[PDB]
Design an enzyme around this catalytic site. Structure first.
Site, PDB file in Angstrom:
ATOM      1  N   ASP A 191       0.827  -1.216   0.000  1.00 33.70           N
ATOM      2  CA  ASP A 191       0.000   0.000   0.000  1.00 33.70           C
ATOM      3  C   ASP A 191       0.863   1.269   0.000  1.00 33.70           C
ATOM      4  O   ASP A 191       0.514   2.259  -0.651  1.00 33.70           O
ATOM      5  CB  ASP A 191      -0.940   0.031   1.226  1.00 33.70           C
ATOM      6  CG  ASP A 191      -2.323  -0.616   0.985  1.00 33.70           C
ATOM      7  OD1 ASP A 191      -2.565  -1.297  -0.035  1.00 33.70           O
ATOM      8  OD2 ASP A 191      -3.203  -0.435   1.864  1.00 33.70           O
ATOM      9  N   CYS A 224      -2.485   0.600 -13.519  1.00 33.31           N
ATOM     10  CA  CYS A 224      -2.566   0.596 -12.062  1.00 33.31           C
ATOM     11  C   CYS A 224      -3.731   1.508 -11.691  1.00 33.31           C
ATOM     12  O   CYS A 224      -4.778   1.419 -12.325  1.00 33.31           O
ATOM     13  CB  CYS A 224      -1.205   0.980 -11.480  1.00 33.31           C
ATOM     14  SG  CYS A 224      -0.417   2.479 -12.240  1.00 33.31           S
ATOM     15  N   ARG A 284       3.404   2.497 -10.966  1.00 30.45           N
ATOM     16  CA  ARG A 284       3.703   1.068 -11.142  1.00 30.45           C
ATOM     17  C   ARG A 284       3.720   0.664 -12.617  1.00 30.45           C
ATOM     18  O   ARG A 284       4.573  -0.130 -13.047  1.00 30.45           O
ATOM     19  CB  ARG A 284       2.679   0.211 -10.387  1.00 30.45           C
ATOM     20  CG  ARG A 284       2.698   0.449  -8.894  1.00 30.45           C
ATOM     21  CD  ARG A 284       1.551  -0.255  -8.195  1.00 30.45           C
ATOM     22  NE  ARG A 284       1.319   0.364  -6.888  1.00 30.45           N
ATOM     23  CZ  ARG A 284       0.341   0.013  -6.057  1.00 30.45           C
ATOM     24  NH1 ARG A 284      -0.515  -0.939  -6.409  1.00 30.45           N
ATOM     25  NH2 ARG A 284       0.220   0.624  -4.877  1.00 30.45           N
ATOM     26  N   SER A 285       2.765   1.173 -13.398  1.00 30.87           N
ATOM     27  CA  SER A 285       2.700   0.850 -14.826  1.00 30.87           C
ATOM     28  C   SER A 285       3.974   1.281 -15.551  1.00 30.87           C
ATOM     29  O   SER A 285       4.466   0.575 -16.441  1.00 30.87           O
ATOM     30  CB  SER A 285       1.484   1.537 -15.458  1.00 30.87           C
ATOM     31  OG  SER A 285       0.247   0.979 -15.015  1.00 30.87           O
ATOM     32  N   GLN A 311       6.539   7.842 -10.539  1.00 33.92           N
ATOM     33  CA  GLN A 311       5.904   8.909  -9.751  1.00 33.92           C
ATOM     34  C   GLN A 311       6.730   9.390  -8.564  1.00 33.92           C
ATOM     35  O   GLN A 311       6.406  10.453  -7.994  1.00 33.92           O
ATOM     36  CB  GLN A 311       4.554   8.428  -9.201  1.00 33.92           C
ATOM     37  CG  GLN A 311       3.430   8.412 -10.201  1.00 33.92           C
ATOM     38  CD  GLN A 311       2.126   7.872  -9.578  1.00 33.92           C
ATOM     39  OE1 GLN A 311       2.011   6.690  -9.244  1.00 33.92           O
ATOM     40  NE2 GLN A 311       1.161   8.751  -9.403  1.00 33.92           N
TER      41      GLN A 311
END
Ligand code: 6SU
Length: 284
Positions: A181, A215, A221-222, A262
């Site tokens: 998370d 994502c 994440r992508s 990110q």
């Protein structure tokens, strides 16, 4: 510089935030006018994440052709990817329309439906064989065929039917279920194992349309997934693998979608994944 020793040099000097901010400063800026039209507000999950006009995927529809999705075309590596946001309640039908129209074999999902106590994307595939889904706005039917649950990821076989023509196709759903998370994984080993399973399926190969990867926003994440894949492919293709420059590859990918990777922690994790992955490919 090479990668593994550039890596230790940034760790020892603690300058990951400065490296990452340089990338942000140099990244491309292109217009995204279609994304910002008022009629498309409920087609965007986040107001600050939009596809560029020049690389956006168009739906084959004359009313409204908009979806928050981008084509990342990597010329030297000879790989293409579609990066998109997690589907919204009012875009699940558009999502499967895109999969159909672009001839994709695989969908890669890097998030859970609920994270941090909030919904990160819609439940857009069926959870039981006998309870199929019909998307009436785009005239598609989707059936769960089989499911294989492993410790870090799940693979599903799905059948997508175009109800207008009665054509059917098999779609593979690759769901990475254990990204934490907060932060990034401590080791890249399970993420690399997952990448190799996607590769082994044929979903990334030229005989199919581009893989669809998402994502929640489709940039963090992508971005890590396609950056690692492309860097490892280039290291196999070139005479000198130490010439692969992960920062330059990332800036090339950011010509096609804003914001890929990110955080500085995601940047460091991408380096780690490529470094460890290059040892397993060989020759070892
Ligand atoms: C349960 O679905 C699967 O795991 C599945 C189904 C059909 C095909 C594949 N391809 S592969 C390359 O991973 O062997 C996987």
């Amino acid at each position: 510089m090479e990668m593994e020793k550039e890596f230790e040099q940034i760790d020892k000097s603690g300058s990951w935030a400065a490296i990452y901010q340089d990338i942000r400063h140099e990244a491309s800026d292109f217009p995204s006018r279609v994304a910002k039209l008022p009629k498309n507000k409920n087609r965007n999950r986040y107001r600050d994440v939009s596809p560029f006009d020049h690389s956006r995927i168009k739906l084959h529809q004359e009313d409204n052709d908009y979806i928050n999705a981008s084509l990342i075309k990597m010329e030297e590596a000879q790989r293409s990817y579609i990066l998109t946001q997690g589907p919204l309640p009012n875009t699940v039908g558009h999502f499967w329309e895109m999969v159909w129209e672009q001839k994709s074999r695989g969908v890669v999902m890097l998030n859970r439906v609920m994270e941090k106590g909030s919904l990160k994307c819609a439940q857009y595939w069926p959870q039981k064989e006998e309870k199929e889904m019909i998307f009436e706005d785009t005239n598609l039917k989707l059936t769960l065929i089989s499911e294989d649950i492993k410790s870090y990821y799940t693979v599903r076989q799905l059948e997508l039917e175009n109800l207008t023509t009665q054509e059917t196709r098999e779609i593979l759903h690759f769901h990475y279920t254990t990204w934490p998370d907060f932060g990034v994984p401590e080791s890249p080993a399970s993420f690399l194992n997952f990448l190799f399973k996607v590769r082994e399926s044929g979903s990334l190969s030229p005989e199919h349309g581009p893989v669809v990867v998402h994502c929640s926003a489709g940039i963090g994440r992508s971005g890590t997934f396609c950056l690692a894949d492309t860097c490892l492919l280039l290291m196999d293709k070139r005479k000198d693998p130490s010439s692969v420059d992960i920062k330059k590859v990332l800036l090339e990918m950011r010509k096609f979608r804003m914001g890929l990777i990110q955080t500085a922690d995601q940047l460091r994790f991408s380096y780690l994944a490529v470094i460890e992955g290059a040892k397993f490919i060989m020759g070892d």
